[PDB]
Coordinates of C-alpha atoms and ligand atoms in Angstrom, one line a residue:
X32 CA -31.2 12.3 -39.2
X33 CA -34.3 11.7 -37.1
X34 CA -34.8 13.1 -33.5
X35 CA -31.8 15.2 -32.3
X36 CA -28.5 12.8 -31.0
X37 CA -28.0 12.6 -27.5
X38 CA -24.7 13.3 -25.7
X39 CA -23.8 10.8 -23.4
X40 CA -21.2 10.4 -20.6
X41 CA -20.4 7.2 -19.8
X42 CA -18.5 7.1 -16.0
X43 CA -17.1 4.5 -13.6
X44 CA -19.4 5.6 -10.9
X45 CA -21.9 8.1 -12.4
X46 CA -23.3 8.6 -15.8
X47 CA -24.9 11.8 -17.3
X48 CA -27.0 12.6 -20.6
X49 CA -27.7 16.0 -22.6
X50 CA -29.2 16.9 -26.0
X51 CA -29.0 20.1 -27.6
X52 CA -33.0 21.2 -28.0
X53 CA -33.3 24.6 -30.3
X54 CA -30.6 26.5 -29.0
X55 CA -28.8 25.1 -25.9
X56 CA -27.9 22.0 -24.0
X57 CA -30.5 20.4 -21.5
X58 CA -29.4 18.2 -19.1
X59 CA -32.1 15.8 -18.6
X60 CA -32.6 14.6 -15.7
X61 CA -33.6 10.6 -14.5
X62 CA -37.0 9.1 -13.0
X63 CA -36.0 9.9 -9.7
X64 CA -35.2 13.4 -10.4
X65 CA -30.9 13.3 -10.6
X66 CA -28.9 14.9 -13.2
X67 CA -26.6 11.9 -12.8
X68 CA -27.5 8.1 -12.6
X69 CA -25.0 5.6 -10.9
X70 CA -23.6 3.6 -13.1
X71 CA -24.7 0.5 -11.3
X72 CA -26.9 -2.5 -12.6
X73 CA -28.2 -4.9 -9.9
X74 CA -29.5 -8.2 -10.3
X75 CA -32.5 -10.1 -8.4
X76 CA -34.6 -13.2 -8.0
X77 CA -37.6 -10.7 -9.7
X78 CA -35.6 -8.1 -11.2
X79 CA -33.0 -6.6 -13.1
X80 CA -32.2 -2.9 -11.1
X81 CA -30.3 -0.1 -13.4
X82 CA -29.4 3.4 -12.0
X83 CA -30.4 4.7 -8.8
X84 CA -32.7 1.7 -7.5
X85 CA -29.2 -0.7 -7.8
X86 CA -27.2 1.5 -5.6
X87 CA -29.9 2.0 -3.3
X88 CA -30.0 -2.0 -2.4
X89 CA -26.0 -2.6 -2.7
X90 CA -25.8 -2.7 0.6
X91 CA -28.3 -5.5 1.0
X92 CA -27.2 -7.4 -2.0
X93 CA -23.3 -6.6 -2.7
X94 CA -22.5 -10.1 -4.3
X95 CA -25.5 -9.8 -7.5
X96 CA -24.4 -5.7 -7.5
X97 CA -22.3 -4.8 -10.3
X98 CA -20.3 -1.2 -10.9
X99 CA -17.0 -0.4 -12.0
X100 CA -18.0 -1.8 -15.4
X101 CA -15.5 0.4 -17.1
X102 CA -12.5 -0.6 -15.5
X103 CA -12.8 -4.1 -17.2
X104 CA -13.8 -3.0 -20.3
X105 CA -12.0 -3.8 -23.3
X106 CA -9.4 -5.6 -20.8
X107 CA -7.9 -8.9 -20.7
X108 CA -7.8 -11.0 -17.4
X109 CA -4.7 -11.9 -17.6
X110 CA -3.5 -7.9 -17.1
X111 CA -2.6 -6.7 -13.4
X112 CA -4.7 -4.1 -13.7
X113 CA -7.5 -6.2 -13.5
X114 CA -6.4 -8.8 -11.4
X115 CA -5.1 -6.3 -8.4
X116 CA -8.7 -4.8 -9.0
X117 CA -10.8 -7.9 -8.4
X118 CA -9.3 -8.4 -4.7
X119 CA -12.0 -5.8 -3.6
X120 CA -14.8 -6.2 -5.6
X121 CA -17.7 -8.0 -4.0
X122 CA -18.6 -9.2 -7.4
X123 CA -17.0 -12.1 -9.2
X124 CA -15.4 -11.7 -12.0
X125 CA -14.5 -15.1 -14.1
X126 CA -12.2 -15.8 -17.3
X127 CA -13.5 -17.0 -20.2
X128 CA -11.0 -17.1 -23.2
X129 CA -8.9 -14.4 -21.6
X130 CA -11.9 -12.0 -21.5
X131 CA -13.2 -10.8 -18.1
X132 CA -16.8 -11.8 -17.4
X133 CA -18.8 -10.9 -14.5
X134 CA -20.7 -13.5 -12.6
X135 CA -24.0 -13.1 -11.0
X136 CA -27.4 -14.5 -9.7
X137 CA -30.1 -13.6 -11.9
X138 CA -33.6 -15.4 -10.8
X139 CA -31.8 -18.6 -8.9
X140 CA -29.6 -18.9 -12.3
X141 CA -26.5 -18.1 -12.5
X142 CA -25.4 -16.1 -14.8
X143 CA -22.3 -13.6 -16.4
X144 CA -21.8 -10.9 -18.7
X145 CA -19.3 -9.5 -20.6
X146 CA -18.3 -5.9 -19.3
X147 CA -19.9 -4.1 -22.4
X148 CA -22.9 -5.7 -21.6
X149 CA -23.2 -4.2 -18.6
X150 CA -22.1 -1.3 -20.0
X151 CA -25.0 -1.5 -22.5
X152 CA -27.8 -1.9 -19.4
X153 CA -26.6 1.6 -18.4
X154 CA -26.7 3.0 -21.7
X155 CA -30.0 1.7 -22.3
X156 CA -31.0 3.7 -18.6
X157 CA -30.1 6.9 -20.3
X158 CA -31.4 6.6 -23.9
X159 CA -34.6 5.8 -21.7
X160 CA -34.4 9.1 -19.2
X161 CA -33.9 10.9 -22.9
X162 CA -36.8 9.3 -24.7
X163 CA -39.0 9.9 -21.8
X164 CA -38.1 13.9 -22.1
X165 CA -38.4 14.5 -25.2
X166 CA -41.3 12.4 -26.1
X167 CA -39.7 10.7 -29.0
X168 CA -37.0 7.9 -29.9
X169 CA -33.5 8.2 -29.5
X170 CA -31.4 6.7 -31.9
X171 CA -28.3 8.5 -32.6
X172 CA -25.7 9.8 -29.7
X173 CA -22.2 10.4 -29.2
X174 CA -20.4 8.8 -25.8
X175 CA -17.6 10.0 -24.7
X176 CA -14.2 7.8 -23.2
X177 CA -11.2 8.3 -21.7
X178 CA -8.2 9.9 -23.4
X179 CA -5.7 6.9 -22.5
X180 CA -8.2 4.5 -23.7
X181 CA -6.6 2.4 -26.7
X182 CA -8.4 1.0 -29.6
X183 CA -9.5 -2.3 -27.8
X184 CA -11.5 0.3 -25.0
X185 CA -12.5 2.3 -27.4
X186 CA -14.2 -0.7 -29.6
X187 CA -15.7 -2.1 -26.2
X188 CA -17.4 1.0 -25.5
X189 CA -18.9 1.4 -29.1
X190 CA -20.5 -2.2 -29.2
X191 CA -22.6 -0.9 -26.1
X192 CA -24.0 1.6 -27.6
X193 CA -24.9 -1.1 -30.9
X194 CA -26.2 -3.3 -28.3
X195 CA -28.1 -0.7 -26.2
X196 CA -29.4 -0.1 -29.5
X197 CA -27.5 3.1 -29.8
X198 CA -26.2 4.6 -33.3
X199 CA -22.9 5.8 -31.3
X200 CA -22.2 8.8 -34.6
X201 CA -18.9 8.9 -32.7
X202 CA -16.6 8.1 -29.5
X203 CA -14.8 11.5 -28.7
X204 CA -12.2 12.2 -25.4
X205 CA -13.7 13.1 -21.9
X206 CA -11.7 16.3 -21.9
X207 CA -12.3 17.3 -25.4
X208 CA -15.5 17.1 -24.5
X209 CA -15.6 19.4 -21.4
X210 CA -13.6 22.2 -23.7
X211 CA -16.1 22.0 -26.4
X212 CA -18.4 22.7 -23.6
X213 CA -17.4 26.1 -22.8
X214 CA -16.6 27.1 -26.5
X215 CA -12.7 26.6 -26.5
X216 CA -13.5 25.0 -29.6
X217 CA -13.9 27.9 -31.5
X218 CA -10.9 29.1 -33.7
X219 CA -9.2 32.5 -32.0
X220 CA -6.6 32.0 -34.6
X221 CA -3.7 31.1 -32.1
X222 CA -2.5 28.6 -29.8
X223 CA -4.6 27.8 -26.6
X224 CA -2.8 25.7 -23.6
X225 CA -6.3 24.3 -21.6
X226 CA -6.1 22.3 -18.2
X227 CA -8.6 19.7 -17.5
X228 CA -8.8 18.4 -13.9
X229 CA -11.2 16.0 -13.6
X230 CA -11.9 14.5 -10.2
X231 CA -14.5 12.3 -10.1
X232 CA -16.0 9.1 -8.0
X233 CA -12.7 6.9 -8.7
X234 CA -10.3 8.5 -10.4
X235 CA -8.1 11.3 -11.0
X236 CA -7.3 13.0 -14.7
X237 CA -5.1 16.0 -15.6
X238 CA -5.0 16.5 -19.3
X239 CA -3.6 19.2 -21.1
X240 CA -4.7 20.2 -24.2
X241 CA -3.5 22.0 -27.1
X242 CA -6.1 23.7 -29.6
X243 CA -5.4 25.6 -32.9
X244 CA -7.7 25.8 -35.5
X245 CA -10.5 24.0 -33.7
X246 CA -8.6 21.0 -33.5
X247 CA -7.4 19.4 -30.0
X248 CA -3.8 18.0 -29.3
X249 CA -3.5 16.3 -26.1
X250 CA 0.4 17.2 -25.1
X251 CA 0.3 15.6 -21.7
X252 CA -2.0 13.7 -18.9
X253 CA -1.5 12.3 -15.1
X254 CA -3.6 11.6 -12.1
X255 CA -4.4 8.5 -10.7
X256 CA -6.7 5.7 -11.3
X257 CA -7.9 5.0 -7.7
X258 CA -8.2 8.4 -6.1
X259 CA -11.8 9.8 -6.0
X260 CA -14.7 10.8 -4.0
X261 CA -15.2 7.1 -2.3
X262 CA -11.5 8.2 -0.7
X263 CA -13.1 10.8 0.8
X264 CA -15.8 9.3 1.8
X265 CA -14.5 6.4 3.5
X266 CA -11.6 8.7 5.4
X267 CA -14.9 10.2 7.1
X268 CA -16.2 6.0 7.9
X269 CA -13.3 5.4 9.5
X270 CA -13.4 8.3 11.5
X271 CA -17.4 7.3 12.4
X272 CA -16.6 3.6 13.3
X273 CA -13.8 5.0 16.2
X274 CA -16.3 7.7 17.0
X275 CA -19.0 5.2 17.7
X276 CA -16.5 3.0 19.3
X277 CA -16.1 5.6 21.6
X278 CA -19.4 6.6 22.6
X279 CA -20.9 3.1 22.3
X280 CA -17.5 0.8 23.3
X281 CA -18.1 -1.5 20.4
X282 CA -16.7 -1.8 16.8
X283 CA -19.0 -2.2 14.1
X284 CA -15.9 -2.5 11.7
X285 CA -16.7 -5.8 10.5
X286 CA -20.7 -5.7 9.9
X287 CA -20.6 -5.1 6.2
X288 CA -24.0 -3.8 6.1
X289 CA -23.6 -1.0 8.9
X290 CA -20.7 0.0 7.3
X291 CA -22.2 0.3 4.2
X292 CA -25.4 2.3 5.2
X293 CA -23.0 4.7 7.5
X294 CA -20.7 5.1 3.8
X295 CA -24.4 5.7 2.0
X296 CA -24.6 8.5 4.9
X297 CA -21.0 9.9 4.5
X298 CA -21.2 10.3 0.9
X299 CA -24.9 12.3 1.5
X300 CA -23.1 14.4 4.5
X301 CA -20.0 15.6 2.4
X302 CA -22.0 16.7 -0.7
X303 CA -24.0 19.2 1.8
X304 CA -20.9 20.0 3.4
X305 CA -19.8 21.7 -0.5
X306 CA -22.5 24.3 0.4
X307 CA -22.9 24.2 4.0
X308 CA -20.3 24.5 7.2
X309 CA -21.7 21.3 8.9
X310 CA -24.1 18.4 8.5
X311 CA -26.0 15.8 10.3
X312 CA -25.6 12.1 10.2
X313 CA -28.9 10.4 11.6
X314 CA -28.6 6.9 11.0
X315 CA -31.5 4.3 12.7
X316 CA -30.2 1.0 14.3
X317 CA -27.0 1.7 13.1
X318 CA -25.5 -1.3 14.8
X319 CA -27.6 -3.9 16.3
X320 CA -30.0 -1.6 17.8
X321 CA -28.1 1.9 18.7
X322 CA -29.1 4.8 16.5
X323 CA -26.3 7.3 15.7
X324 CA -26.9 10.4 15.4
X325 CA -24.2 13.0 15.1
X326 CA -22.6 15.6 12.5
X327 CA -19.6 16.8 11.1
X328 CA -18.1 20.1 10.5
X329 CA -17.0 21.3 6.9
X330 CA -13.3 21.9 8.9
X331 CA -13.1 18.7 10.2
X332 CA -13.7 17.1 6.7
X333 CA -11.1 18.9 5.0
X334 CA -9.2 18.0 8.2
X335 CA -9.6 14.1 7.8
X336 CA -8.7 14.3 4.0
X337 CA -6.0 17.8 3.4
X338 CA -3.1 15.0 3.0
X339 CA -5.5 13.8 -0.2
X340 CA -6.4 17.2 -1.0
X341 CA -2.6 18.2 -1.2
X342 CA -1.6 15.0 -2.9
X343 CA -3.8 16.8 -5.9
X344 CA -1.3 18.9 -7.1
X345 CA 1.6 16.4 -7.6
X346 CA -0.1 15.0 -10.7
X347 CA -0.5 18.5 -12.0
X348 CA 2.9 19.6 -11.5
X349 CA 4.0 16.4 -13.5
X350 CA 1.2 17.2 -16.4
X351 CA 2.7 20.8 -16.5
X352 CA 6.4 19.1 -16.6
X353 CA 5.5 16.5 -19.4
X354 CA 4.5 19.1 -21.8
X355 CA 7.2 21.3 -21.2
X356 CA 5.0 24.1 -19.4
X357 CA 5.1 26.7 -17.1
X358 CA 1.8 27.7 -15.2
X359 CA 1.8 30.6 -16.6
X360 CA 1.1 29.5 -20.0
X361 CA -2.2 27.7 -18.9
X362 CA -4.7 29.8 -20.9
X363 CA -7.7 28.2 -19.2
X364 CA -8.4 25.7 -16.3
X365 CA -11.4 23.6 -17.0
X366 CA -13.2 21.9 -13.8
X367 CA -14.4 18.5 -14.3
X368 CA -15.4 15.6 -11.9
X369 CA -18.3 16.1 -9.0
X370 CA -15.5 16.1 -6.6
X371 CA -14.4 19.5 -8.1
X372 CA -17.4 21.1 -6.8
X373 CA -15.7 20.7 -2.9
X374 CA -14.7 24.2 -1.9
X375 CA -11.2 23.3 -0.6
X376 CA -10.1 21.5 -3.8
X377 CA -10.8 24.4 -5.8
X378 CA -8.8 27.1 -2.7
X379 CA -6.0 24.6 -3.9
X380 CA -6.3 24.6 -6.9
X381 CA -6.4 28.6 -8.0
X382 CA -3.6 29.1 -4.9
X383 CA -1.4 26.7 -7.3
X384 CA -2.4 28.6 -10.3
X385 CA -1.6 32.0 -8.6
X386 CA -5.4 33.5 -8.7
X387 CA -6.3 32.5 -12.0
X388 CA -9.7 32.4 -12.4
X389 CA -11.4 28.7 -12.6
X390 CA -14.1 27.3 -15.6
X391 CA -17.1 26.2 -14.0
X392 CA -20.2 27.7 -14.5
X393 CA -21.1 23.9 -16.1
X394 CA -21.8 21.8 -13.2
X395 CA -18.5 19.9 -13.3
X396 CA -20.4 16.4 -13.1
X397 CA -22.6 17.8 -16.4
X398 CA -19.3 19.0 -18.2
X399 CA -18.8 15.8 -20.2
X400 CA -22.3 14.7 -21.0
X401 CA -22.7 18.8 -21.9
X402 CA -20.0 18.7 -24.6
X403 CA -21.1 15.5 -26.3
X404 CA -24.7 16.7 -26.5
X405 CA -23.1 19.8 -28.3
X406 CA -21.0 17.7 -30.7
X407 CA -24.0 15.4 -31.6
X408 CA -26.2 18.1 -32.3
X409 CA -23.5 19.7 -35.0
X410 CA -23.0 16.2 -36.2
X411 CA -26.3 16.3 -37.0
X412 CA -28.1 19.6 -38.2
X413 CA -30.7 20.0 -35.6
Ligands
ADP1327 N1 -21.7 18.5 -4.1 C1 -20.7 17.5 -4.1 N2 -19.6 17.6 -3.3 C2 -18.7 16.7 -3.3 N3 -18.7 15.6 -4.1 C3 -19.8 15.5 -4.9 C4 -20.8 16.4 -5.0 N4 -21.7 16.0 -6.0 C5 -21.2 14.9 -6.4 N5 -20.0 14.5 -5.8 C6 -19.2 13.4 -6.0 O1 -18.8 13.3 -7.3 C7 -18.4 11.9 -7.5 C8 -19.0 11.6 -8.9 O2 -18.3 12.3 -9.9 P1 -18.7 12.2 -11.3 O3 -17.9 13.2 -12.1 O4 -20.2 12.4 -11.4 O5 -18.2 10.7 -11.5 P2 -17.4 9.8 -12.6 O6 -16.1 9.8 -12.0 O7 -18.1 8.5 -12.5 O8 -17.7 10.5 -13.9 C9 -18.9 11.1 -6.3 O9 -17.8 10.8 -5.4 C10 -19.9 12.1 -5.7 O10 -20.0 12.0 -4.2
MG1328 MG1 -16.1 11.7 -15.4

């Protein structure tokens, strides 16, 4: 009742933050001038690294490095999904009373945090990034979760906004929030069928929702938990590291840090490659003391990923089955995820869907942090 509520998405590799100012949602955008923030907190011998400075030193210092916060969240150890996680983090991960706990090296001591704590660094990042916008102090905000998340996420997730100091006025769906982003909110007096496809860093959701009267039903959701961006990203490594081995006749497969610095390249090279037919990979002392310099085509991208890009539409056809639907009675298709903003994911997408046109004026990456600023500032006043 002070100071407009924020809107805050809360993502496994990116996070994003809105607020409704007079009239429409602005995206506000971090210290180093992104609309998104990685959801990464790093730890130091000086310092404590949230946001884009953490990701920008993983390479250098993977083991004190933490991300994928939310796919421990509210989680027990004991449950396969975190244990078949863990073999590929960098990161420990300890057990203490069945409760995941992340251990690190902060300052020579060692130290670990629960995952809402962590969770609660990144939250801090963005009521920060707001603050410094509007000139004022943000208290109240609405974060947004997963729709499978049960009550024990859902409880994790609100405790990091109370310790970020965060009045969290209240923890809504991801998709619900992207629909309330483009108005399909608002009562037409009739049933509306609305497909979210969110592809983002990690993971892939298909939700579809079923609003009357302003009030959402979620009939059905698929996808997959570990297919996102980083897929992509690393299809285009691998194809580097043989490239390299070609030209240069050795493998710098094994030198974790080239390989991470050539990924930190890839990742650059394919979001150009969404607005441009080719891009440069400049890359100095690659290995040892070789500089690589190349570039890829937007062809041969889509070429080392169409089997992933395909795979897309399985999940969909299964979301459609589940709620006993044809395609035809998709009223609207909602674009969520940064992923959705490749070109050839989208060809796929409307070719599936016969034509129909595609929601996303929103930058897909913005969608969830733009429907949560919307729904704060209605839970609010002004
Ligand atoms: N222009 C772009 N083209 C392709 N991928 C992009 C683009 N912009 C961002 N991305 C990707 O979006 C992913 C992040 O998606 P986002 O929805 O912000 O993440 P999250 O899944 O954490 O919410 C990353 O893989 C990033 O590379
Ligand atoms: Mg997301």
């Amino acid at each position: 009742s002070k100071g407009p509520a924020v809107g805050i998405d809360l993502g496994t590799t990116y996070s994003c933050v809105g607020v409704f100012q007079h009239g429409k949602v602005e995206i506000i955008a971090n210290d180093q001038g992104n609309r998104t923030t990685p959801s990464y907190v790093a730890f130091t011998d000086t310092e404590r690294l949230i946001g884009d400075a953490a990701k920008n030193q993983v390479a250098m210092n993977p083991t004190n490095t933490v991300f994928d916060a939310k796919r421990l969240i509210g989680r027990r150890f004991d449950d396969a999904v975190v244990q078949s996680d863990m073999k590929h983090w960098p990161f420990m991960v300890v057990n203490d009373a069945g409760r995941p706990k992340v251990q690190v090296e902060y300052k020579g001591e060692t130290k670990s945090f629960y995952p809402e704590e962590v969770s609660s660094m990144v939250l801090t990042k963005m009521k920060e990034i707001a603050e410094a916008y509007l000139g004022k102090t943000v208290t109240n905000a609405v974060v947004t979760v997963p729709a499978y998340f049960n009550d024990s996420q859902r409880q994790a997730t609100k405790d990091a906004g109370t310790i970020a100091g965060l009045n969290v006025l209240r923890i809504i769906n991801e998709p619900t929030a992207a629909a309330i982003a483009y108005g399909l909110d608002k009562k037409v007096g009739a049933e509306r069928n609305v497909l979210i496809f969110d592809l983002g860093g990690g993971e892939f959701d298909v939700s579809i929702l079923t609003i009357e009267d302003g009030i959402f039903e979620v009939k059905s959701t698929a996808g997959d938990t570990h297919l996102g961006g980083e897929d992509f990203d690393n299809r285009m490594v691998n194809h580097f590291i043989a490239e390299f081995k070609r030209k240069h006749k050795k493998d710098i497969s094994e030198n974790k840090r080239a390989v991470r610095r050539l990924r930190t390249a890839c990742e650059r090279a394919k979001r150009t490659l969404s607005s441009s037919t080719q891009a440069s990979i400049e890359i100095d002392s690659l290995y040892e003391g070789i500089d690589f310099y190349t570039s890829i085509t937007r062809a041969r991208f889509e070429e080392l990923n169409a089997d992933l890009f395909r795979g897309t539409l399985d999940p969909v056809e299964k979301a459609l089955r589940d709620a006993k639907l044809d395609k035809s009675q998709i009223h609207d298709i909602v674009l969520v995820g940064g992923s959705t903003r490749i070109p050839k994911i989208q060809k796929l997408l409307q070719d599936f869907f016969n034509g129909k046109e595609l929601n996303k004026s929103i930058n897909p990456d913005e969608a969830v942090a733009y429907g949560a600023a919307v729904q704060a500032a209605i839970l609010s006043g002004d």
